[PDB]
């Protein structure tokens with residue numbers, strides 16, 4: 001739960017917080033609001049701006065709603081309250097909802113869906129006639145009298161973008177669109193970039209980019225899109241690419257990349273796609289997430305929020321915050337309290353302080369809490385320092401060909417590292433994200449010596465459970481280790497590799513050794529024929545690479561026979577259960593591989609010839625012992 005040091009308040013209080021509702025005649029009355037939903041909090045020029053649905057009468061989507069704002073110039077000491085956007089007043093369920101926000105300069109751009117009288121769900125409408133996509137510009141103005149700083153925000157007249165909306169995309173006939181919800185972006189080229197969600201006539205849902213090159217005068221829909229079934233997209237920019245992180249009801253969350261401003265989308269199979277999901281079993285309603293790029297401790301990272309939803313459906317208990325540098329993925333922790341139902345969420349890093357505005361739900365009455373994430377930021381900084389330190393350390397090792405070293409120890413795409421630190425049953429990731437689980441082992445410099453049944457370590461992949469941070473390995477990986485065989489096996493015994501989920505004891509790619517002192521590389525389901533020669537007690541360098549559905553095993557820098565073969569046949573992504581180190585098993589054959597393994601490194605890409613050599617030549621230099 002919310003860390004020690006951290007605190008929150010109910011900033012938008014259900015059945016309590018009033019908003020200045022304007023009547024038809026133009027008189028203002030403070031009007032109490034049943035539920036506050038769909039939060040975004042942003043910084044505009046030193047001013048915090050918090051945007052929400054004011055669901056006046058009920059929490060239900062197709063009800064009477066207007067866009068509320070609270071803003072502060074003293075970082076949440078005090079707030080002023082507004083309705084930024086009024087609904088049409090056509091009926092008892094007229095609504096403006098699902099605010100998607102862009103900050104450029106002292107301006108906010110708010111995109112909402114406006115509906116007049118439908119009582120059913122937007123994806124289910126018969127046509128788009130009840131609907132309008134509305135753009136509203138706010139301008140923030142500051143000024144100080146008598147020391148004290150004040151601000152005002154003036155909201156312009158909404159503009160419908162309906163006329164900009166094509167009737168068709170690649171033959172698909174369009175119905176409606178809304179923003180993806182939450183904080184969107186100004187790209188590095190100044191483009192206003194909205195991720196949008198689109199419903200076709202059929203009610204299918206897919207996502208796209210809608211962008212403006214001209215501070216919002218005109219708008220273009222880029223050519224690429226998601227698979228059907230993606231909603232409420234969140235976008236950030238990272239190393240010259242848009243990254244679009246999608247809601248997927250009833251399956252795992254799809255993440256795409258585009259480096260041509262949305263024209264071409266490529267699924268992020270090698271980093272973030274299918275890592276996050278809706279529930280432990282992946283078959284539940286999903287939920288909106290915030291997805292924001294920030295710079296912490298001099299390092300650019302992405303921040304991502306989503307409930308675990310252990311309760312299922314819409315309950316959305318146990319809101320977590322993850323932080324990723326697109327290689328490692330760290331769970332900062334649960335930011336909601338206890339088993340409370342949370343929901344939609346927003347996150348903001350401002351003046352070196354970290355905040356969330358998110359939903360809490362009891363009996364489907366919703367407030368929005370404003371959270372000072374004090375302990376979380378402290379942990380985040382520690383983790384970032386660890387990442388920069390070990391990367392700087394590794395990259396600063398002089399490798400054998402001394403200004404006149406070999407190529408640097410590869411660090412780009414280094415996800416994880418198991419070295420000196422270990423206790424009883426845990427082998428610690430140096431990068432502090434995913435540890436290995438250990439049995440029948442004894443500590444040695446930079447690793448472990450296994451003896452007894454199931455002696456070995458399990459570095460979980462699918463076995464991470466819900467959030468699958470090593471999902472990338474199903475698409476590509478390099479696994480590296482330094483090994484000694486300590487005792488001859490009776491026949492054939494395992495050493496290193498990737499196991500597959502499911503019946504049998506199938507492996508994607510692996511290495512075993514046998515009684516005749518030969519190696520037995522395993523390329524998918526192919527027979528694990530012997531090759532080469534080793535001797536007991538001698539240190540070998542082992543590298544496994546898999547990319548483009550092909551695998552290669554290297555010993556002391558050199559590929560073993562069969563290397564380059566196809567390890568996965570078919571278009572279906574492998575499902576790797578774990579990496580095994582030694583012969584771990586909690587069942588089956590009582591494997592007892594007598595090996596010692598140290599310095600196990602995992603990369604989210606197939607390393608090149610020179611990188612492999614460099615690792616082999618630097619074996620002795622990279623340990624944390």
Ligand SMILES: *[C@]1(C(=O)O)O[C@@H]([C@H](O)[C@H](O)CO)[C@H](NC(C)=O)[C@@H](O)[C@H]1F
Pocket residue numbers: 038061097098113121122123231232286287
């Ligand atoms: C979120 C929510 O799930 O709690 O759902 C949205 C949609 O119902 C959902 O994505 C189905 O298409 C709501 N909006 C609308 C316009 O229906 C969000 O406001 C929110 F309700």
